[PDB]
Design a binder for this molecule. Structure first.
Ligand SMILES: O=C(O)[C@@H]1Cc2c([nH]c3ccccc23)CN1
Ligand SMILES: *[C@@H]1O[C@H](CO)[C@@H](O)[C@H](O)[C@H]1NC(C)=O
Ligand SMILES: [Ca+2]
Lengths: 60, 61, 42
């Protein structure tokens, strides 16, 4: 959840996941935007492993 | 939309952005119904039932 | 909901109801680029 919020917080102006590449505002972030960022999440664990979710939200 | 009238809630009540839970798969399904009603993401840590992989019902899981 | 999408009658004791007037819901997918809206059954 924190990494999805961070990916929201560092959004480049012309690379957003939303319409016309628009980005969200972390000061008034909404639940569905965090869900969208969780669907496209990819980060590295403390032990050093990659964590992504499939098209159904599963981690094998 | 289900209520034509206007409900009132105090501003002290916060807005939950995501939920961590839950353990049981039936409990997770019951929670997931209401949570996906409002597109609130829900990330579980112990629920492992395959029925929660269906995204035509559990949008945010 | 709306006046055209609910059946209301006042009374002393109120009974609820839940019936399928539509066989299924819209098949439109969601990409969450914009705010999700209400889905229409077909
Ligand atoms: O889906 C479920 O209900 C189980 C519950 C469960 C699992 N592993 C556990 C360890 C401790 C306590 C409870 C559990 C696997 N998923
Ligand atoms: C996730 O990021 C890693 C970089 O650490 C990359 O090697 C991998 O291909 C990425 N996976 C997906 C599904 O984007
Ligand atoms: Ca539980």
């Amino acid at each position: 959840i924190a990494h999805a919020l961070q990916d929201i917080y560092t959004c480049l102006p012309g690379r957003g996941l939303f319409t016309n590449g628009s980005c969200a505002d972390i000061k008034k972030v909404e639940a569905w935007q965090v869900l969208k960022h969780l669907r496209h999440l990819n980060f590295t664990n403390n032990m050093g492993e990659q964590v992504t979710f499939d098209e159904c939200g599963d981690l094998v | 939309l289900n209520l034509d009238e206007f409900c009132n809630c105090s501003e002290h009540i916060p807005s939950t952005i995501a939920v961590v839970g839950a353990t049981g798969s039936g409990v997770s399904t019951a929670v997931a119904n209401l949570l996906g009603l409002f597109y609130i993401p829900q990330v579980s840590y112990a629920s492992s039932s395959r029925l929660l992989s269906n995204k035509n019902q559990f949008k945010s899981f | 909901y709306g006046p055209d999408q609910r059946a209301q009658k006042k009374g002393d004791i109120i009974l609820g109801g839940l019936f399928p007037i539509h066989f299924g819901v819209a098949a439109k997918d969601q990409d969450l680029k914009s705010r999700p809206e209400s889905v229409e059954c077909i």
